[model samples]
Target chain A: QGVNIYNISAGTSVDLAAPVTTGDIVTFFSSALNLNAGAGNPNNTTLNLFAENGAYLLHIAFRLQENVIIFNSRQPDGPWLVEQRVSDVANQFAGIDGKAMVTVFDHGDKYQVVINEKTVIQYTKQISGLTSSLSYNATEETSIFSTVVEAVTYTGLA
Target chain B: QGVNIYNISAGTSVDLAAPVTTGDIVTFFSSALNLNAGAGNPNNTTLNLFAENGAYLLHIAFRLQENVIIFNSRQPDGPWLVEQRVSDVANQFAGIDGKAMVTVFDHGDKYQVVINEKTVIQYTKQISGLTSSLSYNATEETSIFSTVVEAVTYTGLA
Candidate 1:
């Protein structure tokens, strides 16, 4: 009798990208992505990118390894929030022809986001002006993938 | 149809600090924090932390103002992949006095734990990590919030 939680956008490709809200703020950057998509969503109806007691997460995917990027968090009947794992600081990837680089930085509880080459690394739970109901996916599953997320920017430090 | 995804990690606790392997990494400096977590079971749960595309997205409870931190690829999903929502800085209060300045950071993909200081962001797609789920009372309606994370530390380039 309690089931009404739907905020889906996994990407088969309506060729989507939305960011630029102005007031509340919303921005996005996506360009050369192959998009295999959650590896072709086999079951569970096929929404793919999950959490809320369901896992299969990925902000961006390419199984063979565009370098490597992974993360998780859930429960609230979401189930997936495991906790730690980080990489990158020495050019993770994004250089052969596939371009994906993202970077955000801060350091106490830690707010370090990097994707200079690829492998892509992100870490944040320092909370502050955090608005939630989050979701993002752009995948090229298994192999033969191409990538390009040129630039995404956010900065403020004093 | 489409609404079923899980790598897995139900709920439960007792880490209060550290001890994570498999690659180990979690970092954050500051991004406005406020965690008291005496009990925030609006269906709150956490553990481990992993992402990119394993699955974890649960975000709904905002309170950090500056010293921003985020690497949550998916979970409680929203405006976070890399965020520092800096409006200013130095905004503190997490049961401030008794002290619960928690800390947990790993920024390659996700997991930036900061309790009592306000920050619980993790997302896992499964790199062999998933543990922490919560539930309580009446008709099996699941939402566990036992809040107490507010460890926001700040410094330098973010």
Candidate 2:
């Protein structure tokens, strides 16, 4: 099967070509330009996932000023949970000159995030709805090039 | 004047021996044990500063599980501000077997934090009152050995 990919832009939400279910994966190819480059305020890039009913599912932020990746999640009507911040993110984003690959695996009960092929975050599903749309916010310093959605199926051994 | 030092423990709020004013400095000597040592949930240590009227001023958390230091502050009645997360904290706390020194300098308009002689955070003043009390929370993985509050006075040249 041919892979389905969507082009991402700032401040715009794109519906997934196909609904994500168990054993599916969503990957983002992003890059940063002039991160922490100036003497003024630093830049930030964020990606948000939402359910079809407008319930927030996941928030991923790249705070280049602090060189950290912050992950936050919450139920639609619940307060945000204590965020997990992963450090030394500059190295992880250094691939191909500030370009990096982020992948989220839907494991039914939990979501596992991998960056540049390295496992970074493992979070339990909080929202009850399936993720149907994704949006991004990027300062002048970053961009999301593409998002790929893939489905995985199990077959009996031949 | 003699330096006022207090022995710190878990789940206790100790009034500062002297009120921290402009030109004053507060330092904490802390240590972590069995940090991320086991295969269970990670541990965290936190230090908080409060004003005389029970207003929260500053919150500093050492998340050893993620190897990051988190700093947050807000006005007495305001919601918490966006936190700053500094990564590679394991290296900063690796002095003398998990021991590290944290110092906070009151500069009238801002608080400057230095850890192990390295400047880590500089936060603008949020609460108007002087710092009169401090408290700490340590999981079984960490401990606070001492807290030193010092008063600095400047003198003109002879």
Top lDDT prediction, candidate number: 2
Q: Which stretches in model 2 have alpha-carbon errors above 4 Å?
A: A1-158, B31-34, B37-43, B75-78, B139-158
- Best candidate (score: DockQ): 1
Q: Model 1, B92-158: lDDT tens per residue?
A: 2323332222334333344344443344444332223432221111111221222222111111211
Q: Candidate 2 lDDT, tens digit per residue, B9-90?
A: 6667788756776655566655344344432223256677788876767787767567777787766677877688778765
- The global C-alpha lDDT for each of the candidates, from Candidate 1 onward, is 0.28, 0.58
**What tier of docking accuracy does candidate 2 attain?**
incorrect
lDDT (Cα, 0-100) at A62 in candidate 2: 71
DockQ for all models: 0.02, 0.01
Candidate 1 chain A, which ten residues in sequence have the lowest lDDT sum? A19-28
* lDDT minimum window of 10 residues, candidate 2 chain A: A149-158
> Any idea what lDDT model 1 has?
0.28
